[PDB]
Scaffold this motif. Structure first.
Motif, PDB file in Angstrom:
ATOM      1  N   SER A 154       0.892  -1.180   0.000  1.00 47.08           N
ATOM      2  CA  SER A 154       0.000   0.000   0.000  1.00 47.08           C
ATOM      3  C   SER A 154       0.921   1.218   0.000  1.00 47.08           C
ATOM      4  O   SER A 154       1.696   1.355   0.965  1.00 47.08           O
ATOM      5  CB  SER A 154      -0.906   0.002   1.203  1.00 47.08           C
ATOM      6  OG  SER A 154      -1.850   1.064   1.125  1.00 47.08           O
ATOM      7  N   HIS A 155       0.905   2.005  -1.073  1.00 46.66           N
ATOM      8  CA  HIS A 155       1.747   3.219  -1.182  1.00 46.66           C
ATOM      9  C   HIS A 155       1.072   4.325  -0.386  1.00 46.66           C
ATOM     10  O   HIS A 155      -0.013   4.762  -0.783  1.00 46.66           O
ATOM     11  CB  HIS A 155       2.034   3.586  -2.639  1.00 46.66           C
ATOM     12  CG  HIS A 155       2.970   4.752  -2.761  1.00 46.66           C
ATOM     13  ND1 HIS A 155       4.264   4.710  -2.300  1.00 46.66           N
ATOM     14  CD2 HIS A 155       2.801   5.985  -3.276  1.00 46.66           C
ATOM     15  CE1 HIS A 155       4.851   5.865  -2.530  1.00 46.66           C
ATOM     16  NE2 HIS A 155       3.986   6.659  -3.135  1.00 46.66           N
ATOM     17  N   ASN A 156       1.690   4.730   0.714  1.00 47.75           N
ATOM     18  CA  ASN A 156       1.154   5.738   1.657  1.00 47.75           C
ATOM     19  C   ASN A 156       2.034   6.990   1.606  1.00 47.75           C
ATOM     20  O   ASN A 156       3.124   6.964   2.185  1.00 47.75           O
ATOM     21  CB  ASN A 156       1.034   5.151   3.060  1.00 47.75           C
ATOM     22  CG  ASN A 156      -0.154   4.219   3.157  1.00 47.75           C
ATOM     23  OD1 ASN A 156      -1.129   4.532   3.832  1.00 47.75           O
ATOM     24  ND2 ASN A 156      -0.115   3.128   2.411  1.00 47.75           N
ATOM     25  N   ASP A 157       1.572   8.054   0.955  1.00 47.79           N
ATOM     26  CA  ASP A 157       2.317   9.346   0.886  1.00 47.79           C
ATOM     27  C   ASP A 157       2.110  10.146   2.177  1.00 47.79           C
ATOM     28  O   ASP A 157       0.966  10.402   2.568  1.00 47.79           O
ATOM     29  CB  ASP A 157       1.918  10.111  -0.374  1.00 47.79           C
ATOM     30  CG  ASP A 157       2.363   9.433  -1.655  1.00 47.79           C
ATOM     31  OD1 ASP A 157       3.609   9.214  -1.823  1.00 47.79           O
ATOM     32  OD2 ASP A 157       1.471   9.113  -2.487  1.00 47.79           O
ATOM     33  N   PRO A 158       3.199  10.493   2.922  1.00 48.99           N
ATOM     34  CA  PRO A 158       3.152  11.394   4.084  1.00 48.99           C
ATOM     35  C   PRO A 158       2.963  12.871   3.696  1.00 48.99           C
ATOM     36  O   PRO A 158       3.826  13.704   3.969  1.00 48.99           O
ATOM     37  CB  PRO A 158       4.537  11.242   4.733  1.00 48.99           C
ATOM     38  CG  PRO A 158       5.088   9.984   4.144  1.00 48.99           C
ATOM     39  CD  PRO A 158       4.557   9.954   2.735  1.00 48.99           C
TER      40      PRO A 158
ATOM     41  N   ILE B 234       9.461   2.888  -4.804  1.00 46.82           N
ATOM     42  CA  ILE B 234       8.577   2.648  -5.979  1.00 46.82           C
ATOM     43  C   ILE B 234       8.121   3.997  -6.553  1.00 46.82           C
ATOM     44  O   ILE B 234       7.763   3.999  -7.719  1.00 46.82           O
ATOM     45  CB  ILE B 234       7.405   1.684  -5.676  1.00 46.82           C
ATOM     46  CG1 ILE B 234       6.536   2.158  -4.509  1.00 46.82           C
ATOM     47  CG2 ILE B 234       7.929   0.270  -5.450  1.00 46.82           C
ATOM     48  CD1 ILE B 234       5.167   1.509  -4.432  1.00 46.82           C
ATOM     49  N   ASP B 235       8.242   5.116  -5.840  1.00 45.88           N
ATOM     50  CA  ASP B 235       7.613   6.363  -6.346  1.00 45.88           C
ATOM     51  C   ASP B 235       8.552   7.559  -6.572  1.00 45.88           C
ATOM     52  O   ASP B 235       8.090   8.522  -7.182  1.00 45.88           O
ATOM     53  CB  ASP B 235       6.440   6.761  -5.456  1.00 45.88           C
ATOM     54  CG  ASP B 235       5.364   7.564  -6.194  1.00 45.88           C
ATOM     55  OD1 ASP B 235       5.260   7.397  -7.412  1.00 45.88           O
ATOM     56  OD2 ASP B 235       4.632   8.325  -5.522  1.00 45.88           O
ATOM     57  N   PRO B 236       9.811   7.654  -6.073  1.00 44.94           N
ATOM     58  CA  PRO B 236      10.639   8.837  -6.338  1.00 44.94           C
ATOM     59  C   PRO B 236      10.854   9.040  -7.844  1.00 44.94           C
ATOM     60  O   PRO B 236      10.861   8.049  -8.563  1.00 44.94           O
ATOM     61  CB  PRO B 236      11.983   8.550  -5.648  1.00 44.94           C
ATOM     62  CG  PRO B 236      11.613   7.572  -4.556  1.00 44.94           C
ATOM     63  CD  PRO B 236      10.478   6.741  -5.127  1.00 44.94           C
TER      64      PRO B 236
ATOM     65  N   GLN C 110      11.660  15.316   3.599  1.00 36.00           N
ATOM     66  CA  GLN C 110      12.451  14.585   2.586  1.00 36.00           C
ATOM     67  C   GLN C 110      11.540  13.761   1.691  1.00 36.00           C
ATOM     68  O   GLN C 110      12.020  13.342   0.638  1.00 36.00           O
ATOM     69  CB  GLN C 110      13.476  13.688   3.277  1.00 36.00           C
ATOM     70  CG  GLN C 110      14.397  14.479   4.195  1.00 36.00           C
ATOM     71  CD  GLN C 110      14.981  15.686   3.502  1.00 36.00           C
ATOM     72  OE1 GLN C 110      15.618  15.596   2.447  1.00 36.00           O
ATOM     73  NE2 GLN C 110      14.753  16.840   4.111  1.00 36.00           N
ATOM     74  N   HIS C 111      10.275  13.544   2.083  1.00 35.27           N
ATOM     75  CA  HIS C 111       9.244  12.852   1.263  1.00 35.27           C
ATOM     76  C   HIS C 111       9.281  13.355  -0.197  1.00 35.27           C
ATOM     77  O   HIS C 111       9.532  14.562  -0.434  1.00 35.27           O
ATOM     78  CB  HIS C 111       7.858  13.009   1.915  1.00 35.27           C
ATOM     79  CG  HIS C 111       6.758  12.511   1.067  1.00 35.27           C
ATOM     80  ND1 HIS C 111       6.814  11.278   0.447  1.00 35.27           N
ATOM     81  CD2 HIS C 111       5.583  13.079   0.709  1.00 35.27           C
ATOM     82  CE1 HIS C 111       5.718  11.115  -0.270  1.00 35.27           C
ATOM     83  NE2 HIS C 111       4.943  12.213  -0.119  1.00 35.27           N
ATOM     84  N   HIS C 112       8.996  12.466  -1.143  1.00 36.91           N
ATOM     85  CA  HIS C 112       8.993  12.738  -2.599  1.00 36.91           C
ATOM     86  C   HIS C 112       7.779  13.586  -3.012  1.00 36.91           C
ATOM     87  O   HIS C 112       7.670  13.831  -4.205  1.00 36.91           O
ATOM     88  CB  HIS C 112       9.097  11.457  -3.424  1.00 36.91           C
ATOM     89  CG  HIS C 112       8.031  10.459  -3.126  1.00 36.91           C
ATOM     90  ND1 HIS C 112       8.193   9.483  -2.169  1.00 36.91           N
ATOM     91  CD2 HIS C 112       6.827  10.254  -3.687  1.00 36.91           C
ATOM     92  CE1 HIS C 112       7.105   8.750  -2.126  1.00 36.91           C
ATOM     93  NE2 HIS C 112       6.253   9.201  -3.037  1.00 36.91           N
ATOM     94  N   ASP C 113       6.959  14.070  -2.075  1.00 35.95           N
ATOM     95  CA  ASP C 113       6.039  15.213  -2.353  1.00 35.95           C
ATOM     96  C   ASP C 113       6.356  16.405  -1.430  1.00 35.95           C
ATOM     97  O   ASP C 113       5.655  17.429  -1.542  1.00 35.95           O
ATOM     98  CB  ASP C 113       4.578  14.769  -2.300  1.00 35.95           C
ATOM     99  CG  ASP C 113       4.269  13.682  -3.306  1.00 35.95           C
ATOM    100  OD1 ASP C 113       4.527  13.912  -4.544  1.00 35.95           O
ATOM    101  OD2 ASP C 113       3.865  12.576  -2.846  1.00 35.95           O
ATOM    102  N   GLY C 114       7.433  16.337  -0.640  1.00 41.06           N
ATOM    103  CA  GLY C 114       7.900  17.421   0.249  1.00 41.06           C
ATOM    104  C   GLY C 114       8.852  18.377  -0.448  1.00 41.06           C
ATOM    105  O   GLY C 114       8.414  19.323  -1.107  1.00 41.06           O
TER     106      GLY C 114
END
Ligand SMILES: OC[C@@H]1NCCC[C@H]1O
Ligand SMILES: [Zn+2]
Length: 994
Positions: free
Chosen positions: A59-63, A173-175, A437-441
């Motif tokens: 389950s891909h969970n974006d912070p 899996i998402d960067p 550092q999240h890939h939507d941060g």
């Protein structure tokens, strides 16, 4: 130690080499749009050579992305982990992987003790497996390697503390593209395997054709292969179920059982419940997909991920996915004609099986070096936009990075009473920085209200570091016989000239013969060598003199305080002045100085002249002169001579007195958005052709000239541009305000006669410099790369390096040029699911250093080496941007106990060595105190020009010292002297104290 300069590693796949050979043709491949029609020989499989299939639920969970951390937690993630705990407990054969430890810590601490122990049981028996176990799944483009290690350490420390597990397999899996910084850090943190997904569709095809999707990823300088980490690249367009079962999403989508009655298959064939009536046909359809996927890999072990964004939320999705897949597994495993063993598995289970196959001589894997930037998911849709999107918060990342390092280092020297709440503060600061550092941060690819959440969290983190830093400095410089702290008191406020810059924040030190005659100030130096750096403070009078605490006079300069107002013209203060002087600070140490007012001009303070080319200044003793726009030349100290155009933009640099005037022109240009076809967004950079010059009009140019520091400032449209000179490489500051210029990207370009050709160098995560080659065969946006800390061009004689205080996007689009994007305002969405453009721009102060150098006497790497290396001067200039001196103004009128210096006895280590991290690992209540150190040694180019540092002995009464993983979580070598580390190596040590 390896030579990382003269020896070129021999690898099967070198990505710069591959990129030159590849044609990047976007041909329609069939059901697999970006590959080909996979064919296998079915006689490949028999009862002694079966296909082993691990179906790994996830389950891909974006912070943070569309919603904030907390919004997603309440709406989605808490339900996913509740259902994971319940369904895994109840179904012992069911498996699940989890990456984001920020969400898992949030969830776990809210459980009753019974649930906590149930959670522990499903981790102990390998049902729920943590993959990577970082706080987030970080961005790999913009992130500094220090913050990648920070967020990894925060997640794995939580996992080891509360679950007694340390993952050795990574899942990314998402960067938006992939950095070799990740295996570098992972392999020195005990990892054995890693998985990546978002690489260029042409790279997937190229590697898939040679079965080079699994590879031993080593660093570009690593001749020996000691850095090597086993990497699995997934072959297809997405990590979703349509793109993970095999090459035909139309078939794979039918095996995503959540898509039955409010999600559907875009290929219009729905999933069907598995029954005795259809299991034979369904199994044939699926196993044919699996066996095509297996042709792309070298073993008979197949990874089949089973998940998507925020999946496994509803109990009935657990049912429908588990039960249908079990019916398939039961049919397939019982039917010998398939020659498949299929089952639910974890990532570690996959990698373990693959390495068993390797040991049995069943496969030998290729070696690879290079990176996977810039990513395209299709046609010409290159994700170079996010190298620049929301540049304000990109700058804020680097500021918070430094404050967390300083706060942890300063507070490490002592144990603190829990009433001080040092640990509380540092944990908040590390976690807010880790979350960003999240890939939507740091990427700037989140919705406006989520960016606001990240900004507010980082602001609270900054305030937390300030409180720890001031408390620490007061303790380190107050006589122990007097030291009696109020842990709630502000003994110092921090003064920061570079953040926010933008806002009118900085406090004026108010002096007067009667009111308050003198002020103590303190400079901190986080770096482990002696440093001299100009510092400045705002003061109420220009008649100020600087001394050390021993009353030795210190040469100082006073400048006016200038601001810019909207044509764009400067205005001067009549009530505050900058006092500027050179602080000498010990390694990892503190130095105290004193600012004193007088009647009139003191012996050791000079005053700068001001020239307005196109205003009262209170008691400032030198009046502002005026004049027509004209060329100017300035020199400070024996450092370089810089010439400026009549618009206030650098035109040339003369290094020394007897050397040439080398042309170096700064120029602002703009990129636009395509009218027809694909629109630039938060992610995508899709310019309508080359950049066009910005009309500068008739701009006001301010020239300040002093003994210690001079500058040329100009108010351009969108940008106050400033060149500052202090006697070496100049400092560039852009105050960037893109305001209302919709569908505009503002770029800053340097134009030289340097004979670079198609070659330029850009860094990865501020750790290493990688060789780029401009490719005319690829569109403009594909020649854009991350500039997380620096870029350079060079020929046989001359190098030019631009160092950044903030991650931005950039290129060399022609011989002797460098360019770097400043900001981007985009009216349109780029159709990657953010569902908005970028219209929330705000003023940001960008900071740079500009190093023009002669390299003909420098030992350059082989013309075949994929790496470049900084000079001493460029490295030290990057250090001055990222880790400058910290400035403390004493809050109160009097400071009894005041000492002049801390750390005068600290060793001054060679220039290429850094104590990246100093962190006390134990609270006061612990019998044995323990302190973690990360040591990084870079590699500097030898051009023809210090004590030993042993961190084991920095604190007194060392009982024990070992080399650890970079996370400090496992001992690798019992020693009590820390050995010195090789060029381009990073080592961790933990010292124990009695
Ligand atoms: O992390 C959330 C999104 N996932 C799909 C790719 C873009 C990214 O922002
Ligand atoms: Zn994501």
């Amino acid at each position: 130690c390896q030579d990382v300069v003269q020896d070129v590693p021999n690898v099967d796949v070198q990505m710069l080499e591959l990129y030159d050979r590849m044609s990047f043709k976007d041909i329609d491949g069939g059901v697999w749009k970006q590959g080909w029609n996979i064919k296998y020989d079915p006689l490949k499989y028999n009862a002694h050579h079966k296909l082993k299939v691990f179906v790994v639920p996830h389950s891909h969970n974006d912070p943070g992305w569309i919603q904030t951390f907390e919004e997603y937690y309440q709406h989605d993630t808490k339900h996913i982990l509740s259902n994971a705990l319940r369904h895994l407990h109840d179904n012992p054969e069911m498996k699940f992987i989890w990456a984001e430890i920020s969400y898992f810590a949030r969830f776990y601490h809210d459980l009753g003790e019974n649930k906590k122990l149930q959670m522990k049981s499903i981790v102990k028996n390998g049902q729920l497996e943590f993959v990577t176990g970082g706080w987030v799944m970080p961005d790999e483009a913009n992130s500094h390697w220090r913050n990648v290690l920070l967020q990894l350490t925060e997640g794995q420390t939580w996992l080891k503390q509360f679950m007694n597990v340390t993952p050795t397999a990574s899942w990314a899996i998402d960067p938006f593209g992939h950095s070799p910084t990740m295996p570098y850090i992972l392999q020195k943190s005990g990892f054995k395997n890693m998985l990546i997904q978002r690489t260029h569709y042409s790279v997937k095809k190229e590697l898939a054709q040679q079965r080079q999707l699994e590879f031993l990823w080593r660093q570009i300088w690593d001749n020996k292969g000691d850095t090597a980490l086993f990497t699995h690249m997934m072959p297809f367009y997405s990590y979703d179920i349509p793109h993970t079962c095999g090459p035909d999403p139309k078939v794979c989508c039918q095996f995503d059982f959540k898509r039955m009655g409010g999600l559907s298959c875009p290929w219009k064939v729905p999933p069907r419940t598995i029954s005795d009536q259809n299991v034979a046909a369904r199994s044939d359809l699926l196993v044919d997909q699996w066996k095509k996927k297996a042709e792309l890999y070298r073993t008979n072990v197949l990874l089949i991920p089973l998940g998507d964004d925020f999946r496994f939320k509803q109990n009935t999705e657990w049912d429908v996915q588990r039960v249908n897949y079990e019916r398939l597994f039961e049919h397939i495993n019982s039917q010998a004609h398939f020659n498949v063993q299929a089952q639910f598995g974890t990532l570690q289970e996959y990698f373990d099986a693959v390495h068993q196959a390797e040991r049995a001589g069943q496969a030998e894997f290729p070696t690879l070096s290079g990176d996977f930037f810039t990513y395209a998911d299709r046609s010409d849709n290159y994700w170079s936009g996010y190298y620049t999107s929301r540049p304000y918060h990109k700058r804020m990342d680097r500021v918070l990075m430094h404050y967390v390092r300083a706060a942890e280092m300063l507070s490490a020297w002592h144990s603190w009473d829990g009433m001080a709440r040092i640990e509380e503060r540092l944990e908040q600061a590390r976690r807010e920085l880790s979350l960003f550092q999240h890939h939507d941060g740091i990427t700037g690819t989140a919705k406006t209200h989520v960016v606001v959440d990240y900004e507010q969290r980082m602001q609270e983190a900054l305030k937390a570091c300030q409180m720890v830093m001031q408390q620490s400095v007061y303790r380190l410089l107050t006589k122990p016989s007097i030291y009696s702290p109020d842990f709630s008191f502000s003994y110092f406020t921090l003064d920061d000239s570079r953040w926010p810059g933008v806002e009118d924040s900085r406090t004026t030190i108010i002096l007067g013969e009667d009111i308050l005659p003198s002020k103590h100030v303190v400079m901190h130096n986080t770096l482990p060598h002696w440093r001299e750096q100009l510092v400045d403070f705002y003061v109420s009078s220009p008649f100020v003199s600087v001394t050390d605490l021993a009353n030795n006079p210190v040469e100082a300069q006073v400048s006016p305080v200038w601001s810019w107002h909207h044509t764009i013209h400067p205005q001067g203060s009549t009530t505050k002045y900058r006092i500027i002087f050179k602080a000498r600070v010990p390694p990892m140490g503190l130095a105290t100085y004193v600012l004193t007012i007088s009647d009139s001009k003191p012996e050791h303070t000079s005053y700068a002249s001001n020239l307005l080319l196109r205003l009262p200044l209170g008691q400032y003793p030198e009046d502002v002169k005026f004049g027509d726009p004209r060329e100017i030349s300035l020199r400070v100290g024996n450092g370089p001579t810089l010439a400026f155009s009549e618009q206030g933009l650098l035109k040339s640099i003369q290094l020394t007195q007897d050397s040439p005037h080398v042309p170096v022109h700064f120029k602002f240009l703009k990129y636009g958005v395509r009218s027809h076809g694909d629109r630039s967004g938060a992610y995508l950079f899709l310019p309508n052709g080359p950049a066009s010059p910005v009309e500068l009009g008739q701009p006001v140019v301010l020239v300040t000239k002093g003994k210690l520091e001079s500058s040329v400032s100009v108010g351009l449209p969108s940008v106050v541009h400033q060149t500052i000179m202090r006697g070496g490489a100049p400092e560039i500051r852009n105050l960037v305000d893109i305001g209302s210029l919709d569908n505009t990207e503002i770029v800053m370009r340097l134009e030289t006669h340097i004979d670079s050709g198609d070659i330029f160098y850009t860094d990865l995560n501020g750790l290493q410099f990688i060789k780029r080659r401009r490719l005319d065969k690829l569109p403009l946006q594909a020649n854009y790369y991350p500039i997380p800390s620096g870029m350079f061009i060079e020929d046989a004689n001359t190098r030019l390096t631009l160092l950044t205080g903030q991650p931005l996007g950039g290129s060399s689009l022609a011989s002797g040029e460098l360019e770097i994007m400043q900001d981007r305002r985009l009216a349109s969405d780029d159709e990657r699911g953010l569902g908005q453009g970028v219209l929330d721009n705000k003023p940001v102060l960008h900071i740079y250093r500009l190093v023009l150098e002669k390299v003909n006497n420098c030992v350059r790497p082989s013309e075949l080496h994929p790496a470049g290396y900084l000079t001493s001067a460029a490295h030290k200039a990057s250090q001055s941007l990222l880790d400058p001196l910290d400035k403390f103004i004493f809050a109160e009128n009097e400071w009894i106990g005041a000492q002049g210096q801390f750390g005068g006895d600290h060793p001054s280590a060679r220039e290429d060595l850094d104590v990246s991290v100093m962190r006390r690992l134990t609270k006061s209540s612990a019998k044995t105190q323990r302190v973690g150190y990360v040591l990084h040694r870079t590699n500097l180019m030898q051009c023809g020009t210090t004590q030993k540092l042993d961190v084991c002995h920095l604190l007194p009464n060392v009982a024990r010292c070992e080399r650890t993983t970079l996370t400090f979580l496992q001992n690798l070598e019992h020693l009590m002297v820390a050995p010195e580390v090789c060029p381009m190596e990073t080592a961790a040590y933990v010292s124990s104290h009695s």
